[PDB]
Amino acid sequence: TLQERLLAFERDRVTIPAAQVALAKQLAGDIALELQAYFRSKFPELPFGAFVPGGPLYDGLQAGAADHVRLLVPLVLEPGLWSLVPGVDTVARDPRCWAVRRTQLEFCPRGSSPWDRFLVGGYLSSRVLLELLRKALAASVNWPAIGSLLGCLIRPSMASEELLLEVQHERLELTVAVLVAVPGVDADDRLLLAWPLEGLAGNLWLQDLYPVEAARLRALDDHDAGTRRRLLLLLCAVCRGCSALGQLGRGHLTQVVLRLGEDNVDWTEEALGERFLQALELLIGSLEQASLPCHFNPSVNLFSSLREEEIDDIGYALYSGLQEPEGLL
Amino acid sequence: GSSPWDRFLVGGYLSSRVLLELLRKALAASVNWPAIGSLLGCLIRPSMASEELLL
Amino acid sequence: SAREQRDCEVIERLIKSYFLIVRKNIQDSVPKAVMHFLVNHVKDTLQSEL
Amino acid sequence: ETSELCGGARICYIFHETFGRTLESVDPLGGLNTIDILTAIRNATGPRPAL
């Protein structure tokens, strides 16, 4: 049955060997620590905090190399000299993006802060920050020393700000998503990500609500010992094993599962099959509308970047999934 | 001259005739029917009367 | 058209294949030019320059 | 002095880990819109008919 198949499917397709997981977590820390040391010597002028490993690898079960290792780089801005502004409030009117405003220049003029090297007009440049830090990773970092130290092949990606473990001696490969972001809040959740906007002002930033969403699903499960995140984990593996769902990533599934999570149904493992089909129905309906409003921000349509016809075709593929549940597994 | 539709202004009225002449010309030749046929996987062209198209 | 699309796909394959041949050669060509015209040059010139 | 890669093999790095990889990311199918190509080959034919 679907229920039985999902249980096996978790064991066979969700679980990514614990040995690789442990090694990935070790390397996540090791890479972070190396980059901490490097940034201390490369950017002694900037107040970089301790880098933090995170993401699916920790946030859930044995994700391992199934998704990126998230690596926080803490942009400790000088409290009072910098302020958070909505993108929509500026000429570059994009509410999804954010700006970091330089202020108190009457007491602390530009050139006094180390972050004023990124000061354009009166705002902090995420773009220039990315350019320098990506360059540091691209070439400045002695990846031959890192590989020699850790016993592996580690190098920089050719897109965004990611790293690649080409192979750790102990049969492990993985990627690292380096998230350079302002600490942000005292909840240790919401971050101001140095976003790489190509249009409008590339100096703009992204409000990172990942750990907020993750914590929410965690909390929702902890409220009643439910399995909302287990469903998400199953769905993630379904997308990994289904090319039709290549347009729907973890973020897409997260928005769906957050919507599902806000409900009062049988949340135990015994109804994985039931809720699996419910997840399909909710997702398909959203696909039929070509609209997926983010749970924590309904103005963000996660299907807006996808072709309507392809969106419908995905819904049709998932609909056949409803017809033959186990065929997605 | 203030409205875009004043290009069809004859006397004090909107010219359906000139509108048709330009738009039929657009369909007759201007539209890249080779791109349309290539895109949709078909033979589509303009008719030789009124303002009609033929698949 | 469909047959022509298939012919286009043939063309795309030819483009990819030849391009990759070219790019592969470039991967070795440039480095060498840099070494020749810049690096090895100044390596010997600098003494007389100084 | 043992430190950041520089001077010699750093250029080797530039010619492989940077440059070689950079080129590997380029195309090889980039820009190849089937339909635009069909237009292009129609243009390549030009005013004449073609076999």
List subunits contacting chain B, requiring 3 or more Cβ pairs under 8 Å.
Answer: C, D
Contacts of A270 (CB under 8 A, 6+ apart): A3
Which residues lie below 8 Å from residue A131, measured CB to CB, with a gap of 6+? none
C-chain residues near B41 (CB < 8 A): 1-2, 5
Residue window 7-46, chain B: list those with CB within 8 Å of chain C: 37-38, 41
Q: Which residues contact C13 (CB under 8 A, 6 or more apart)?
A: none
Q: Based on the number of CB atoms within 10 Å of its own CB, is A123 exposed (0-12), middle (13-18) or buried (19 or more)?
A: buried
- A139, A147, A179, A180: which is closest to A165 by C-alpha? A147
Backbone φ and ψ for D49, nearest 5 degrees, come out as: -85, 160
CA distance D49 to A273: 61
How distant is the alpha carbon of residue A268 from its chain centre? 27
Q: What is the rounded CA–CA span in Å between residue A324 and residue A329? A: 10
Shortest Cα distance, chain A CAs vs residue D50, angstroms:
35
Task: Say if D6 is an interface residue toward chain A (CB within 8 Å).
Answer: no
> Which residues in chain B are contacts of C5 at CB distance < 8 A?
38, 41
Could you tell me if residue A75 is left (phi over 0), alpha (psi between -120 and 50 degrees) or otherwise beta? beta
State the DSSP code for D46: T
Which residue does chain A place closest to D20, by CA atoms? A158
* Contact assessment for residue A256 and residue A278, using Cβ atoms and an 8 Å cutoff: no
Amino acid at A102: R
Q: Chain-centre distance of CA B24, in angstroms? A: 3
Distance (Å, rounded) from C-alpha A74 to C-alpha A208? 13
Which amino acid is residue B24, in one-letter code? R
Q: Which 3 state secondary structure label does DSSP give C3?
A: helix
Positive or negative CA dihedral for B21, B25, B26, B28?
positive
C-alpha dihedral sign at B15, B20, B25, B26 = positive
Alpha-carbon gap, residue A326 to B18, rounded angstroms: 62
Query: Among A52, A121, A134, which Cα is nearest to A90's?
Result: A121
Residue pointed to by tokens 């930033």: A205
Test A142 with D25 for CB contact under 8 angstroms: no
Kindly report the nearest CA distance between residue C40 and chain D, in angstroms: 12
* 3-state secondary structure at position A74: strand
Cα separation of D18 and A138, whole Å?
A: 7
What are residue A162's DSSP bridge partners? A177
Long-range contacts of C10-16 (CB under 8 A, 24+ apart): C11/D37, C11/D41, C12/D29, C12/D32, C12/D34, C12/D37, C15/D28, C15/D29, C15/D32, C16/D27, C16/D28, C16/D29, C16/D32
- Between CA B29 and CA C3 the distance in angstroms is 25
Tell me which DSSP letter residue A120 carries: E
Gap between the Cα atoms of A213 and A229, Å rounded: 11
Element (H, E) at A173: strand A172-182
* Residue A191, both tokens: 């971050």
Looking at the DSSP assignment, which residues form a beta bridge with residue A164? A155, A175
Name the experimental technique.
cryo-EM
**Separation in Å, CA of D30 to nearest CA in chain B:** 19
Token code pair at residue A86:
């909505």
Q: Is some CB atom of chain D closer than 8 A to the CB atom of B32? A: yes
Enumerate the residues of chain D whose CB falls inside 8 A of the CB of residue C34: 15
Partnered with residue A48 across adjacent β-strands are: A75
A267 alpha-carbon distance from chain centroid: 25
Q: What is the separation, in whole angstroms, between the first and last Cα of chain D?
A: 69
Furthest-apart CA atoms within chain C: distance in Å: 68
Q: Is A20:A64 a contact under the CB 8 Å cutoff?
A: yes
Q: Which helix (H) or strand (E) holds C29?
A: helix C3-34
> Which residue of chain B comes nearest to D43, CA vs CA?
B34
Could you say which of C4, C15, C39 has the minimum Cβ distance to residue D32?
C15
Closest CA to A138 of A120, A154, A125, A156: A156
- Tell me if C2 and B38 make a contact (CB, 8 A cut-off): no
**Cα nearest neighbour of B35 on chain C:** C1
Question: Can you tell me the distance from the alpha carbon of B10 to that of C45, in angstroms, rounded to the nearest whole number?
Answer: 80
Residues of D in contact with B35 (CB under 8 A): 35, 38-39
Mutation target vs B (from D38, D41, D45; most B CBs, 10 A cutoff): D38
D8 shares contact with chain A (CB less than 8 Å): no
CA-to-CA distance for A301 and A305, rounded, in angstroms?
8
How far apart (Å, rounded) are the C-alpha atoms in residues A7 and A13?
A: 10
How crowded is residue D42: how many other Cβ atoms within 10 Å of its Cβ?
Answer: 15
Degrees (nearest 5) of the Cα angle C1, C5, C6?
Answer: 125
**A99 pairs with which residues across the strands?**
A85
Within 10 Å of residue A115's Cβ, how many Cβ atoms?
A: 23
Token duo for residue A87: 């993108």
C2 reaches B (C-beta below 8 A)? yes
Interface test with A, best of D16, D18, D19, D26 (most A CBs within 10 A): D18
Burial class (CB in 10 A: 0-12, 13-18, 19+), C21: exposed
Cβ burial A270-298 (10 Å sphere, 16+ → b, else e): ebbbebbeebbebbbebbeebebbbbeee
Which residues are registered as beta bridge partners of A75? Answer: A48
Which string of DSSP letters, residue by residue, matches A277-317? HHHHHHHHHHHHTT--EETTEEEEETTTTS-HHHHHHHHHH
Q: How many CB atoms lie within 10 A of CB A221?
A: 16
B47 backbone dihedrals φ, ψ, rounded to 5° = -75, 175
**Which residue intervals of chain A are DSSP H helices?**
2-9, 18-42, 126-135, 143-150, 210-224, 228-240, 250-261, 272-288, 308-323
Angstrom CA distances, A297 to A37, A79, A293, B27, stand at 37, 27, 7, 45
Question: Cis peptide before B4, with omega less than 30 degrees from 0?
Answer: no
Q: Which two tokens stand for residue A85?
A: 């502004």
* Resolution for the entry shown, Å: 4.2
Query: Which residues of chain D are at the C interface, by a Cβ-Cβ cutoff of 8 Å?
Result: 11, 15, 19-20, 23, 26-29, 32, 34, 37-38, 41
